[PDB]
Amino acid sequence: DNIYTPRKYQVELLEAALDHNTIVCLNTGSGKTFIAVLLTKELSYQIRGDFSRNGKRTVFLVNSANQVAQQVSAVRTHSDLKVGEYSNLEVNASWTKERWNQEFTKHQVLIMTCYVALNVLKNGYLSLSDINLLVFDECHLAILDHPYREIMKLCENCPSCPRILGLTASILNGKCDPEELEEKIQKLEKILKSNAETATDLVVLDRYTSQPCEIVVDCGPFTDRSGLYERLLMELEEALNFINDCNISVHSKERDSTLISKQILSDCRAVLVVLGPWCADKVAGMMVRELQKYIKHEQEELHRKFLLFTDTFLRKIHALCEEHFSPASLDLKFVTPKVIKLLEILRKYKPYERQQFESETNFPSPFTNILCGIIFVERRYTAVVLNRLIKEAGKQDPELAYISSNFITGHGIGKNQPRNKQMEAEFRKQEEVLRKFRAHETNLLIATSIVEEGVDIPKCNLVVRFDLPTEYRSYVQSKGRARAPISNYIMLADTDKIKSFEEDLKTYKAIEKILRNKCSKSVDTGETDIDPVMDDDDVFPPYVLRPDDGGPRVTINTAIGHINRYCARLPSDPFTHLAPKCRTRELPDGTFYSTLYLPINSPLRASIVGPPMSCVRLAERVVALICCEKLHKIGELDDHLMPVGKETVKYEEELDLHDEEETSVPGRPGSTKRRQCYPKAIPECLRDSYPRPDQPCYLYVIGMVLTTPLPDELNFRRRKLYPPEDTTRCFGILTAKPIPQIPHFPVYTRSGEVTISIELKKSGFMLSLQMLELITRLHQYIFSHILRLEKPALEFKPTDADSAYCVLPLNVVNDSSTLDIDFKFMEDIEKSEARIGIPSTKYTKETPFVFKLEDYQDAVIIPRYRNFDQPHRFYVADVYTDLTPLSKFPSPEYETFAEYYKTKYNLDLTNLNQPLLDVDHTSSRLNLLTPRHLNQKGKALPLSSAEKRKAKWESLQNKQILVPELCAIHPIPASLWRKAVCLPSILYRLHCLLTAEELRAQTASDAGVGVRSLPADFRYPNLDFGYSSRTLGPNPGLILQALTLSNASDGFNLERLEMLGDSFLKHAITTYLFCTYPDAHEGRLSYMRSKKVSNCNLYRLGKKKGLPSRMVVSIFDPPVNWLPPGYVVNQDKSEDDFLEYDQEHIRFIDNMLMGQSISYDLHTEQCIADKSIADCVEALLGCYLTSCGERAAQLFLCSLGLKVLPVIKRTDREKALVLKDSEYGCLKIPPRCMFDHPDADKTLNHLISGFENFEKKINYRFKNKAYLLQAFTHASYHYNTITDCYQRLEFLGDAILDYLITKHLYEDPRQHSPGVLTDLRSALVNNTIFASLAVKYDYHKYFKAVSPELFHVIDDFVQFQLEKNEMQGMDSELRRSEEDEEKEEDIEVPKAMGDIFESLAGAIYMDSGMSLETVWQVYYPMMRPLIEKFSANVPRSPVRELLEMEPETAKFSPAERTYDGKVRVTVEVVGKGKFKGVGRSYRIAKSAAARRALRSLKANQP
């Protein structure tokens, strides 16, 4: 259609057509439109302007309206020029000169048919000095009197001549003598006033290996040794002349029998003559089943009878061949020796045991030590049975048993129904056979002799003929399919093929010799060189910048190998194939002028001119080894002339990630398996704060201020409200060590959220040892006896404790709003035996016990009839004065309480005057950081799973009301109980938030941002989970969120800040590594950024502040894992081994100037996945960015000691626009990145042509243009030495494009959960969507290149794009069914477009100010709809849906080692079926197997 595979020959010799008249001829007939855009577009400099500057217009000339539409579409979908058209002669008969001036002002590519061209030229309407390209299509017509010769006459006389481009693919048709071609070439040349070469498309030999050698191969006489051939051929002749009398007139192909019957007859007859009867025997079954399917598909009497006769004839052959001989143990004494000799030549090249072969006299290769050949046979009705014969023969020959020959059977003749999916099926199976053959899974390809064109099968060891060809192109292609290391061309020939073979050989040999004597449009030498090379390393010394001693003596061709391997490893795409082209060409000096075509994609590109020499070999050697000299001067070069990039700077990336899974042993450094214990960490402000004899004591106070009520439909116990505002006293905190203001922080009591506070109310005074002794005693009493904390492990020892600070209640005294310590209360405690519970004096009638109205209020009772070793603690929840010790029991198992207690412990009251009460338990749970009255599955429905311990024992123990007679009075009022019980949770939080404070204080001390001291000016808000604002660092409230992991089941954990931190981290160090390399590369940049962002690499950086020490990970339940301040544990029981190597990957780059698993104790340490340290730093960066902006986060990442900015000094950073030095100087911009010259800016003028329509789409106006050229200059375009390729900026932008879209997916108001915000961070960044957008907005039209492949596939892909309009705008998005996705996959996206898209992003950023802002207000237009549809519904995928619906019964298998690279992942699910799906990629195969499993899941369990 509009697509072809362009000509390689012209990839670098279009340069001819650029500067002189030419003719070019290609036999394929392809690469014609794709030879048209490449010369037309490339000369837009003289076409874009007006017709009053008198800029010339570009005729086109073809001889069909077909070709008019063709070239029309050839320019619009690859060009920027205003395309015109004309194919009519009548409307052209009615224009005037100035009308045609307007028409010349409208278009700039003037498709003209023939007669109209002649007329509008000869009637003085357009000078032949207004042309600058006159294409002729089918220029062969010149030999006959054709309109071409006359217009050429015309141009002969006008005083200008455009270039010329005379194309043809008809003068090499069929076979003809060299005189014919040569004379036609001379005639055409002189007619088109242009030099013209002899065809350059029939030279197909490989000069990167030994060329396939033309020799006829021989089998000669063969004798028949079964006895069936004679009678078989006789019956075949009889049936043949019989079917020649059953002819039916022309109809559809299954309404005639004579054609298919005669064809299969000829097939089996040839099969017989050339192989034997057993093969036609074995294909008889397939033939008759095929014709059976056919005869069921259609019936009509004549062809019915005839197909019946053919089928019974074939079965008759089968019955004869099977009767006369057993099909098993097939001997080669039954076989025509031709096939025996055939077997010999085939098995010539198979593996050798004596020298180990990768899966000698033939030097190691898996394609000349192991057969990977192709063999050509006339039909496909003999190939499959040729393989069947190879199996039933090589059963006794091991040389043939480990041949894994694959036959090819696609479509023969006849078809059952149109558009049968079988076409696509055999399509994909042949694609598998192809991708196997190339990678050697195939050991032999048995193909038809009609499938050798319109397709190429590469790396054929043995291009073997077993049917003879009879035409030039056929022979040439059959040869040309050998791309293997020791390749030869096998013309195995019987007693009559030899003559024709030798004839074809000699004839086509003369043909190709004359075809190669005149290439590049001049007389020259072909694939062979000017002169075979003499040993000249003595003439130019081989050692390159190396007087290194030792070392070998080598031959000269070692130099060829080395310089060719200089560019066989360079980092760049598999669409680019280049070399520094040694231009040894005659420029008029008496000698051969010599320069170097340096590859543009290497850091040094400046052309060099060494000394010239009259012998081309010598000057060639001069420039080659001075090349090697200078390239080792820059040190981009080593011994043996190989580039360092991606050879040894490539380092293993399994020592970062998990490749040891589901195991328990230390594995990769930073796996879940790598584990190390770190010590718990304590503020200095809780250390040595133990009361000592000299202490100016300060006394804080806890606000206990309730704000939010909570309904009792949100209370799943239906508890009646108690306020934390029911307050008299407040638990102080007593020390002379000072405690900074702590941002108010929440808890959960049983009235909602409550805002704890830390403030002051007194300060300064000291105490006697007596009071200190008393207070310490009250401390230990609280934590010991109140909540029952103690296990024997601890022992109270406050002097030398790790962290001692007491508590003691603080109460309103001095009769004012200031408060103080209420000794009285301590004393009242001491007076009682109610410190230890169950006092020894009883009060029922041992001492008369009577009703007290207020002492069963605001108090806490203790039963004494039960649990005599370990009391519980109840307190009045509903005091009752309407209940009595004589009243109804709560359940009618009694009717009075005294009977109840008399029936258990034989206790009958005689003083019954205390009404009974409802009361409640104490310390049911000690976890108060997240709701315990409400689940974490969401509880709109009643009942939670976090109140099943003693909030279920409550209300089965409240089933009995209590007469206060048998319960002592614990000596603390209910106010202080409510308060204190929160002290385990509240003091714990302080321990964490104080940690955070110390953390931030230190980092501010070492960084520029913030200060060690805190004025407390920065607003410190309450944390939310389910003075000024000058940057002083963020509130400690965020710093803790980053520190915790998702393992604490808190409301907030460090997932979110992982991504915002990661993205920004990339971008920071990408643009770092870029603008710090005056000349950079890929291999360098790839292996500089890749290990800098490593889970292992970060670990080490974390050990500079000790951040692992302060993490929060284990769920906090106090009896197990938290000790109270003042206790010292005593037990009741009485690495770098993969991180030494990672660092060398970012250091092997400077070879050139850059520019339980461990048992641990629960109360003093921790142990954690090593994965954590990755996450904490990845979320700490995240905090600092999203709360204090760029320059801050910059300096924060800079504080650790990592060079986000290049290492200079703090003083350089500061004056270029407590605190101390850990910083680095600001960024530098390269002092050169290309070559600048005012003249010869026609390419810049091309960039001008470039912007005339590229300013509007990007809505941008550059103030530098260079970088805009660098945008789209691909790797293989080479007419530009002023700029560089699009790699570096493909890279400088990828981080920025992404970082931007992470930014704008974090600041979204929904702020949705970070378990899906990693489904808009690798579904909005992948080359499919990136390529798709670039094309729609016309980035492709201004695409610079020479390569064929890009251009072919890009025409394809853009066609498909523009057929879609908006995706689903026409209702089509083709994913509803599997067949839709299968029709989608039938196009493979380029990987050219996504490239430039990211690159141009880089461009907008780097052109001026490096201010993401500008990038954002450019790109946001084009990206916007993609975000908006994506974030409309997040894109769930089949892999995710299968892995999440079925938790671990459905999985995917890991990647398998396969030669083709197509992996048939088998879903690891039992009961959902196993679906073997082979997909071009592991991703798409995984998704396809998932879709199959999900279809089954819906058809079985919807």
mmCIF file of N, CA, C and O in Angstrom, residues 570-613:
data_model
loop_
_atom_site.group_PDB
_atom_site.id
_atom_site.type_symbol
_atom_site.label_atom_id
_atom_site.label_comp_id
_atom_site.label_asym_id
_atom_site.label_seq_id
_atom_site.Cartn_x
_atom_site.Cartn_y
_atom_site.Cartn_z
ATOM 1 N N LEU A 570 28.433 -0.632 20.997
ATOM 2 C CA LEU A 570 28.163 0.732 21.439
ATOM 3 C C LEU A 570 26.711 0.868 21.896
ATOM 4 O O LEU A 570 25.803 0.330 21.257
ATOM 5 N N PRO A 571 26.467 1.546 23.014
ATOM 6 C CA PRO A 571 25.087 1.757 23.441
ATOM 7 C C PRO A 571 24.338 2.623 22.449
ATOM 8 O O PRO A 571 24.534 3.840 22.374
ATOM 9 N N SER A 572 23.439 1.973 21.714
ATOM 10 C CA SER A 572 22.482 2.636 20.838
ATOM 11 C C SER A 572 21.544 1.610 20.228
ATOM 12 O O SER A 572 21.809 0.406 20.294
ATOM 13 N N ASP A 573 20.488 2.081 19.579
ATOM 14 C CA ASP A 573 19.333 1.247 19.291
ATOM 15 C C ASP A 573 19.659 0.174 18.254
ATOM 16 O O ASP A 573 20.633 0.292 17.507
ATOM 17 N N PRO A 574 18.867 -0.899 18.215
ATOM 18 C CA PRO A 574 18.998 -1.886 17.139
ATOM 19 C C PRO A 574 18.289 -1.458 15.858
ATOM 20 O O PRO A 574 18.006 -2.285 14.983
ATOM 21 N N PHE A 575 17.976 -0.168 15.752
ATOM 22 C CA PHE A 575 17.546 0.434 14.501
ATOM 23 C C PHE A 575 18.668 1.193 13.810
ATOM 24 O O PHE A 575 18.506 1.592 12.653
ATOM 25 N N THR A 576 19.798 1.383 14.491
ATOM 26 C CA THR A 576 20.946 2.132 13.993
ATOM 27 C C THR A 576 22.092 1.169 13.725
ATOM 28 O O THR A 576 22.430 0.351 14.585
ATOM 29 N N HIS A 577 22.686 1.265 12.541
ATOM 30 C CA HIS A 577 23.869 0.484 12.208
ATOM 31 C C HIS A 577 24.823 1.379 11.441
ATOM 32 O O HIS A 577 24.529 1.780 10.313
ATOM 33 N N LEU A 578 25.975 1.659 12.035
ATOM 34 C CA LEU A 578 26.853 2.696 11.517
ATOM 35 C C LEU A 578 28.300 2.336 11.804
ATOM 36 O O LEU A 578 28.601 1.420 12.569
ATOM 37 N N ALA A 579 29.187 3.101 11.188
ATOM 38 C CA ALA A 579 30.614 3.037 11.455
ATOM 39 C C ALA A 579 31.194 4.400 11.136
ATOM 40 O O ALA A 579 30.624 5.158 10.343
ATOM 41 N N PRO A 580 32.340 4.733 11.705
ATOM 42 C CA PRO A 580 33.004 5.956 11.256
ATOM 43 C C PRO A 580 33.540 5.689 9.869
ATOM 44 O O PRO A 580 34.526 4.967 9.684
ATOM 45 N N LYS A 581 32.861 6.248 8.882
ATOM 46 C CA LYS A 581 33.128 5.902 7.498
ATOM 47 C C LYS A 581 34.408 6.596 7.064
ATOM 48 O O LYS A 581 34.467 7.826 7.005
ATOM 49 N N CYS A 582 35.451 5.813 6.814
ATOM 50 C CA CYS A 582 36.717 6.376 6.359
ATOM 51 C C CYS A 582 36.528 6.870 4.932
ATOM 52 O O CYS A 582 36.494 6.085 3.983
ATOM 53 N N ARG A 583 36.368 8.181 4.782
ATOM 54 C CA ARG A 583 36.241 8.813 3.477
ATOM 55 C C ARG A 583 37.641 8.978 2.908
ATOM 56 O O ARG A 583 38.327 9.968 3.170
ATOM 57 N N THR A 584 38.085 7.968 2.160
ATOM 58 C CA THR A 584 39.272 8.069 1.317
ATOM 59 C C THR A 584 38.783 8.284 -0.108
ATOM 60 O O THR A 584 38.462 7.323 -0.814
ATOM 61 N N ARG A 585 38.729 9.542 -0.531
ATOM 62 C CA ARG A 585 38.149 9.877 -1.819
ATOM 63 C C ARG A 585 39.043 10.881 -2.518
ATOM 64 O O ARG A 585 39.722 11.684 -1.875
ATOM 65 N N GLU A 586 39.055 10.813 -3.841
ATOM 66 C CA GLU A 586 39.883 11.722 -4.614
ATOM 67 C C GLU A 586 39.274 13.118 -4.585
ATOM 68 O O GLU A 586 38.224 13.361 -5.188
ATOM 69 N N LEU A 587 39.931 14.029 -3.875
ATOM 70 C CA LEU A 587 39.690 15.453 -3.970
ATOM 71 C C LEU A 587 40.941 16.115 -4.528
ATOM 72 O O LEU A 587 42.056 15.740 -4.150
ATOM 73 N N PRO A 588 40.797 17.082 -5.433
ATOM 74 C CA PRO A 588 41.885 17.393 -6.372
ATOM 75 C C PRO A 588 43.085 18.008 -5.673
ATOM 76 O O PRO A 588 43.183 19.230 -5.519
ATOM 77 N N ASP A 589 44.031 17.154 -5.287
ATOM 78 C CA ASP A 589 45.321 17.576 -4.759
ATOM 79 C C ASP A 589 46.473 16.746 -5.306
ATOM 80 O O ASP A 589 47.614 16.975 -4.898
ATOM 81 N N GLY A 590 46.226 15.813 -6.224
ATOM 82 C CA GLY A 590 47.209 14.828 -6.606
ATOM 83 C C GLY A 590 47.190 13.570 -5.766
ATOM 84 O O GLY A 590 47.788 12.563 -6.169
ATOM 85 N N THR A 591 46.517 13.590 -4.618
ATOM 86 C CA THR A 591 46.441 12.451 -3.718
ATOM 87 C C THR A 591 44.989 12.219 -3.319
ATOM 88 O O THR A 591 44.089 12.975 -3.689
ATOM 89 N N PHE A 592 44.773 11.145 -2.562
ATOM 90 C CA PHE A 592 43.444 10.745 -2.101
ATOM 91 C C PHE A 592 43.166 11.426 -0.766
ATOM 92 O O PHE A 592 43.723 11.047 0.266
ATOM 93 N N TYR A 593 42.300 12.434 -0.784
ATOM 94 C CA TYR A 593 41.974 13.153 0.436
ATOM 95 C C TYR A 593 41.236 12.232 1.401
ATOM 96 O O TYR A 593 40.435 11.384 0.993
ATOM 97 N N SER A 594 41.504 12.404 2.694
ATOM 98 C CA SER A 594 41.030 11.469 3.705
ATOM 99 C C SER A 594 40.429 12.215 4.884
ATOM 100 O O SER A 594 41.082 13.079 5.476
ATOM 101 N N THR A 595 39.187 11.873 5.220
ATOM 102 C CA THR A 595 38.543 12.359 6.434
ATOM 103 C C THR A 595 37.773 11.217 7.083
ATOM 104 O O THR A 595 37.628 10.133 6.515
ATOM 105 N N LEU A 596 37.306 11.460 8.304
ATOM 106 C CA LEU A 596 36.550 10.478 9.069
ATOM 107 C C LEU A 596 35.099 10.906 9.206
ATOM 108 O O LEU A 596 34.818 12.027 9.640
ATOM 109 N N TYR A 597 34.182 10.008 8.858
ATOM 110 C CA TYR A 597 32.790 10.140 9.257
ATOM 111 C C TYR A 597 32.663 9.543 10.650
ATOM 112 O O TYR A 597 32.476 8.338 10.809
ATOM 113 N N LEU A 598 32.774 10.378 11.652
ATOM 114 C CA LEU A 598 32.540 9.870 12.992
ATOM 115 C C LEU A 598 31.057 9.573 13.184
ATOM 116 O O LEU A 598 30.207 10.326 12.703
ATOM 117 N N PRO A 599 30.725 8.475 13.838
ATOM 118 C CA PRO A 599 29.361 8.316 14.338
ATOM 119 C C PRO A 599 28.959 9.558 15.099
ATOM 120 O O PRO A 599 29.764 10.115 15.850
ATOM 121 N N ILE A 600 27.721 10.003 14.922
ATOM 122 C CA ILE A 600 27.300 11.209 15.614
ATOM 123 C C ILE A 600 27.005 10.907 17.083
ATOM 124 O O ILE A 600 27.112 11.792 17.938
ATOM 125 N N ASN A 601 26.694 9.650 17.410
ATOM 126 C CA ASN A 601 26.213 9.266 18.729
ATOM 127 C C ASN A 601 27.329 8.994 19.719
ATOM 128 O O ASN A 601 27.080 8.375 20.756
ATOM 129 N N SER A 602 28.546 9.434 19.429
ATOM 130 C CA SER A 602 29.648 9.256 20.356
ATOM 131 C C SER A 602 30.166 10.625 20.778
ATOM 132 O O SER A 602 30.052 11.586 20.009
ATOM 133 N N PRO A 603 30.710 10.759 21.992
ATOM 134 C CA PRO A 603 30.908 12.105 22.550
ATOM 135 C C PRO A 603 31.828 12.990 21.733
ATOM 136 O O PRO A 603 31.662 14.215 21.761
ATOM 137 N N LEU A 604 32.780 12.430 21.000
ATOM 138 C CA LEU A 604 33.653 13.229 20.150
ATOM 139 C C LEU A 604 33.278 12.999 18.692
ATOM 140 O O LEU A 604 33.272 11.860 18.218
ATOM 141 N N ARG A 605 32.963 14.085 17.990
ATOM 142 C CA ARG A 605 32.407 14.004 16.651
ATOM 143 C C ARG A 605 33.156 14.837 15.623
ATOM 144 O O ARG A 605 32.784 14.809 14.445
ATOM 145 N N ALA A 606 34.182 15.578 16.028
ATOM 146 C CA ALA A 606 34.843 16.536 15.148
ATOM 147 C C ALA A 606 35.631 15.807 14.064
ATOM 148 O O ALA A 606 36.519 15.003 14.369
ATOM 149 N N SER A 607 35.315 16.100 12.800
ATOM 150 C CA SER A 607 35.979 15.443 11.679
ATOM 151 C C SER A 607 37.474 15.735 11.680
ATOM 152 O O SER A 607 37.914 16.836 12.023
ATOM 153 N N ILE A 608 38.258 14.738 11.286
ATOM 154 C CA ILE A 608 39.710 14.836 11.286
ATOM 155 C C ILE A 608 40.202 14.552 9.878
ATOM 156 O O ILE A 608 39.547 13.830 9.118
ATOM 157 N N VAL A 609 41.347 15.130 9.527
ATOM 158 C CA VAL A 609 41.981 14.915 8.232
ATOM 159 C C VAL A 609 43.459 14.627 8.480
ATOM 160 O O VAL A 609 44.246 15.544 8.733
ATOM 161 N N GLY A 610 43.837 13.356 8.413
ATOM 162 C CA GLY A 610 45.224 12.961 8.545
ATOM 163 C C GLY A 610 46.001 13.193 7.269
ATOM 164 O O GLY A 610 45.471 13.650 6.244
ATOM 165 N N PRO A 611 47.297 12.893 7.324
ATOM 166 C CA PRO A 611 48.149 13.049 6.140
ATOM 167 C C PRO A 611 47.640 12.202 4.989
ATOM 168 O O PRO A 611 47.230 11.049 5.190
ATOM 169 N N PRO A 612 47.629 12.742 3.773
ATOM 170 C CA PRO A 612 47.162 11.979 2.615
ATOM 171 C C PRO A 612 48.286 11.217 1.937
ATOM 172 O O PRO A 612 49.463 11.572 2.017
ATOM 173 N N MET A 613 47.895 10.144 1.254
ATOM 174 C CA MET A 613 48.842 9.262 0.594
ATOM 175 C C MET A 613 48.249 8.773 -0.718
ATOM 176 O O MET A 613 47.039 8.554 -0.818
#
